[PDB]
Design a protein around this ligand. Structure first.
Ligand code: ADP
Ligand code: MG
Lengths: 318, 122, 255, 128, 156, 317, 128
């Protein structure tokens, strides 16, 4: 709660959907009404929604927090049915954004005891996985058209093992896991590099240099991670000049991972940067290679491309 | 308390126990050699070692003697520090394992009881 | 069908955790009394009656067999949770996977210290037994000192060698996806490491070495790969030919 | 009433933890089966409904507003528990206070890392 | 636990006793960072009182955060500033203890009834560093700060 | 597993049968069919079972994993009935092996759960103590004889305070701890001498002599263990007279605790030894004294009585 | 009988822990609501009404007495558990036996520092 799901998905609609050629569907499920009003009015401004004619490229379906359980448990299906139509009756690439699909599962638990059922673990209904499966299996590309679905998924009390999130994992092809622990440091998006995965992250797909850079980043981060708590007590003085040297780059990589979002300008107090894949790979490649060992960690915090961290490094003089 | 937490702390504090243990052994070896060279030489984090000399701080012959005594002392100190620190870690591991098992048992019971209550109210 | 007709079958149940959720669902809706994690009392009996059907038939019953590789997904490392606890007791052993090894570079993320096979050598060829026994002992030694690594700024040559073998062997355990190798190729690459030939090669290179060395023996030394099978083990000849190959090759590799 | 007549009102709900306890009592006495922590399944909805009623109206509707400051009491400082997280997931941010900061002399005992505003600088003057 | 937890909202002053303190020999076993009062306000107890009480609580909380480190490496890695807090906090903890008349049998000391002014004074002085030269045990089980001194002398 | 458990059981059978007349019963609670057949065929080859002539000393009761919980909860009782016959009708001292007691509790839990009962702490049945005590009390020494029970214990989550194990602790008198570390030192049986304990290890029961020897061995072994550190680091060169004797003696005792099992013969190619309680006490008593210090370690390794240690020595020179 | 007839008795309850589990078996089989460690809410009364019966009568009621030495088994020295604290809150002190002292050969393994006796001094002999 409060780690960035919505900001991140807003960023995605901003980049991917604004340039998307085809229709888009957004289903607000069990979320804030104010956010609905925020989004609606922002889309009218960008022209994504046009009230004066037939250029609108996004349909909206809402069933927020102020509604009763029956509504919140069915909206997602409402949003999904609209999208399905575009898919089958057109084949056109449809984008589907759902915030937050956990509310379909929470709504069910809400009426579960009145339906007569013995509770299952952690209070959930016994039909959780079946209920979730008959829905999620409709949210899919088929041979007829393709749907690129983005689902924000709430994690009760921050526990990723809770029945709800834990059952949602197998329904996805790429998962972006957010951590309050990271967000608490000021790193945003609060993505966990050691917990986010993707089916297409394979050398025979993203290619070798992409694959190796990614694998190298996670390794240097997992090394550091396991030392943190240790040197926290013992001290850094025993780390060899080679070890302590990796701790430096880990830290920079950690910060280079942040990125000012266009959408989050009201919170960062920074102008949104957007970085192309190739420049992304180069920035990280370079850091791993010891290149920017001479720059200060803070140079890396909250910038776009690697060149901005070099610049910032200079500005840091005074 | 939290199973996640305790587990993490135990992984850390178990590492520390071994590292500290090894540093006791290295110090012990170094001190042994030094001790041997102690008398001969007298003819011509390391505990509170650094602390002591510094707090009170406010050719050849002397240099050689001073340094010889100092190394022996240092490695002695460090050996003791590590010995105590690995000992502290062990006791703390044991105390955390207990706490992990108490929490573990209560959690299981608590989720059990919620399930039964909700079944019996039907 | 294969097991009873002199054939051999392999069955993978991916996952048994989900079969158990499905069963639990029906059990709770039928209003059967729930238990730990709301599972029914006979949930163990669900899996047991399943896994036991896996079996090695005697010659009088055709000698066929059914091997089974059930999958279980744990939550945040909880091997003592209910379904895991049950399937761990029903089976002959486990191959434990860890997130932490995965991101460190160890893939498959198998944990060598915790995985087990109660059957062990009974189902392992002599050649593999030979090299595997040395590697299992070396890695075991490595595990004990492995922590002192990054802080042992004066480790003695003895413990310092344990470390080097340990990193070398871990690197030879890494293996790319969708590339299952034959047993003769496995002994050959393990041989390299357990015989100390790679003790000088820098760890970061061991992965590139193995791939080059393996592709080379596959091509020019087929006859040595077949011999490793025939002899059942590493013959005295194979043992000298391998020494010539890896030494020369290594030398070329670091030219 | 203020909200819908172009005035502005602020409401403090001190505290919603006790309110959820009273609901749990009433629900349990009505013979509704207990869920997580004995609280009824719709405890989220009990607070959710409530808090959505605090809003900013547009000019066509009078431009009045209702701002809310619900208060939640944690136990032993766990913001990651059921109820707490229920309410955090409703509001537009949270001010987390802590006894450790409080005793160190950091009063108000605000924990900057865990506290947030989902409105940001849009709620500040240009000066601030 | 539901019972105690619900009971806190019904009080104006709370005294939370601790098993870990009592086991250290401290009596009364009061937890100086968990017992509060609605009167603990500068306009009610006066600024001198309020300040000293906030001073003691800050040094106890500071000591408490250092305990995570102390536990493994001990005090050898503490700054000289840190050690200073550790010495005074330990003198504050013991000086909070007090022989009760009703517990004479278990403490083996006469009872003490210390007047407020004398309580402020002693704590102020410990905060100021005035007794940084007395040994900790001197401050254990006494009444007014003066007895801490007398006990110190006896120890020599 | 892999610590010589099936071999120890097989010896105990054979050893109690030779020296006491009484048979053994093996109760397989939630036996895996695979391991069952293996334990069967291994029994046949060891001779503890004979598929031909009535020399069989062990009766097997198997409650397999595929069976419903009621069956697996009852099997220790069926095996208990068989054992009871040899006690109450033949006046023998029966040996009852329960493998393993944890699976008897779990079957208990599963049964109660299907019966619709509210579970107790950590999930176990409400009747956990009683279910346990009604089966265990049948295991005693009566006027006609006795049943002694060797029962394999699994400790859940490694937690000794788990209701399951803490319940079973109430009824045990002794524990035999088998360790892979010791196995690895080639010490067979792989019995850890410091962890294995016994209640009847009181002078008032096993006598003052037996007690003092036992304590002497346990002590010499604890001291040695401690010395290890110094030996390696400060070097095993500055050990005083008293210090080097401990290390040498300790190692003789340690190696003298190995013993060729009569059942091992089939593979070891060495005649199994059954050591009488007198030779054991005397044997270690003398080592402690130092009477055999003038012998090489390997003299005590895998022998029988103390006599065989000297013998072997002379031969090994 | 002894206590009320001018005579002195001593009863030893070995142990109350095992009693508390049998009562828990009865309670769960009656379907009484489980709480801490799945024990019923009256486990405190179970021991309190029992131990209150051990007392010292004054001369007008015959001067007899009944002394009780209830026994409780802890798990890994956890004297803060439900049952242990319960009996601690009933009795007049405790004699702690540490697993550490025992195993180290100290017998009887009493932890003098944690053992207490709330009302025993007055009854201790002047010689002592
Ligand atoms: N990318 C970001 N950059 C800066 N701050 C962010 C970012 N994402 C989230 N936040 C901060 O954290 C708060 C919580 O964000 P939000 O997306 O609404 O949470 P949720 O994960 O609950 O959907 C935001 O209002 C903002 O203050
Ligand atoms: Mg959101």
């Amino acid at each position: 709660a409060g780690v960035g799901k919505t900001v991140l998905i807003m960023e995605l609609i901003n980049n991917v959907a604004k340039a998307h050629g085809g229709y888009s569907v957004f289903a607000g499920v069990g979320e804030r009404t104010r956010e609905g009003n925020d989004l609606y009015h922002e889309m009218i401004e960008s022209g994504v929604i046009n009230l004066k004619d037939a250029t609108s490229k996004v349909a909206l379906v809402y069933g927020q927090m102020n509604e009763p359980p029956g509504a919140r448990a069915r909206v997602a299906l409402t949003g999904l049915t609209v999208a399905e139509y575009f898919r089958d009756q057109e084949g056109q690439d449809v984008l589907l954004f759902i915030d937050n699909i956990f509310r379909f599962t929470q709504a069910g638990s809400e009426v579960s005891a009145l339906l007569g059922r013995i509770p299952s673990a952690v209070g959930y209904q016994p039909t959780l996985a079946t209920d979730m499966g008959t829905m999620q299996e409709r949210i899919t590309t088929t041979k007829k058209g393709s749907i690129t679905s983005v689902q924000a998924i709430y994690v009760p009390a921050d526990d990723l093992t809770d029945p709800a999130p834990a059952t949602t994992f197998a329904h996805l092809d790429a998962t972006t896991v957010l951590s309050r622990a990271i967000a608490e440091l000021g790193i945003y998006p609060a993505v966990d590099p050691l917990d986010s995965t993707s089916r297409i992250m394979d050398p025979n797909i993203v290619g070798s240099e992409h694959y190796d850079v990614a694998r190298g980043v996670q390794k240097i981060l997992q090394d550091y991670k396991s030392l943190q708590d240790i040197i926290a007590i013992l001290g850094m003085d025993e780390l060899s000049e080679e070890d302590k040297l990796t701790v430096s780059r880990a830290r920079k990589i950690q910060r280079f991972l942040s990125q000012p979002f266009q959408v989050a300008e009201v919170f960062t107090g920074h102008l949104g940067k957007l970085v192309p894949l190739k420049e992304t790979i180069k920035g990280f490649q370079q850091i791993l290679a010891g290149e920017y060992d001479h720059l200060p960690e803070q140079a890396f915090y909250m910038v776009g491309p690697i060149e901005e961290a070099v610049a910032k490094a200079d500005k840091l003089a005074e | 308390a939290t199973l996640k937490d305790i587990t993490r702390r135990l992984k850390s504090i178990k590492n520390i126990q071994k590292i500290t243990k090894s540093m006791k052994m290295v110090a012990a070896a170094k001190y042994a050699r030094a001790e041997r060279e102690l008398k001969p030489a007298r003819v011509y984090l390391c505990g509170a070692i650094h602390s002591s000399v510094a707090k009170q701080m406010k050719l050849a012959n002397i240099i050689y003697y001073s340094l010889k005594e100092s190394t022996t002392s240092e490695q002695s100190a460090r050996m003791t520090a590590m010995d105590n620190a690995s000992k502290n870690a062990s006791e703390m591991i044991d105390k955390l394992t207990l706490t992990f098992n108490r929490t573990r048992q209560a959690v299981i019971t608590k989720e059990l009881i919620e399930i039964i209550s909700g079944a019996a109210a039907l | 069908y294969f097991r009873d007709n002199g054939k051999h079958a392999l069955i993978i149940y991916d996952d048994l955790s989900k079969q158990a959720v499905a069963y639990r669902q029906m059990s709770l809706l039928l209003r059967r009394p729930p238990g730990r994690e709301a599972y029914p009392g006979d949930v163990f009996y669900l899996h047991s009656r399943l896994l036991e059907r896996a079996a090695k038939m005697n010659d009088a019953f055709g000698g066929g067999s059914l091997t089974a590789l059930p999958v279980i997904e744990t939550q945040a490392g909880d091997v003592s949770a209910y379904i895991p606890t049950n399937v761990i007791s029903i089976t002959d052993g486990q191959i434990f996977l860890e997130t932490e090894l995965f991101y460190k570079g160890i893939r498959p993320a198998i944990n060598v210290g915790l995985s087990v096979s109660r059957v062990g050598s009974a189902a392992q060829t002599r050649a593999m037994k030979q090299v595997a026994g040395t590697m299992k002992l070396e890695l075991a030694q490595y595990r004990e000192v492995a922590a002192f690594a990054q802080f042992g700024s004066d480790l003695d040559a003895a413990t310092q060698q344990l470390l080097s073998r340990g990193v070398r062997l871990t690197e030879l355990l890494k293996q790319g996806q969708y590339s299952p190798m034959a047993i003769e190729e496995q002994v050959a690459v393990i041989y390299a490491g357990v015989r100390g030939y790679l003790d000088k090669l820098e760890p970061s290179k061991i992965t590139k070495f193995e791939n080059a060395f393996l592709s080379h023996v596959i091509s020019q030394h087929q006859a040595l790969l077949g011999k490793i099978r025939t002899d059942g083990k590493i013959s005295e000849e194979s043992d000298a030919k391998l020494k010539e190959i890896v030494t020369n090759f290594l030398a070329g590799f670091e030219a």
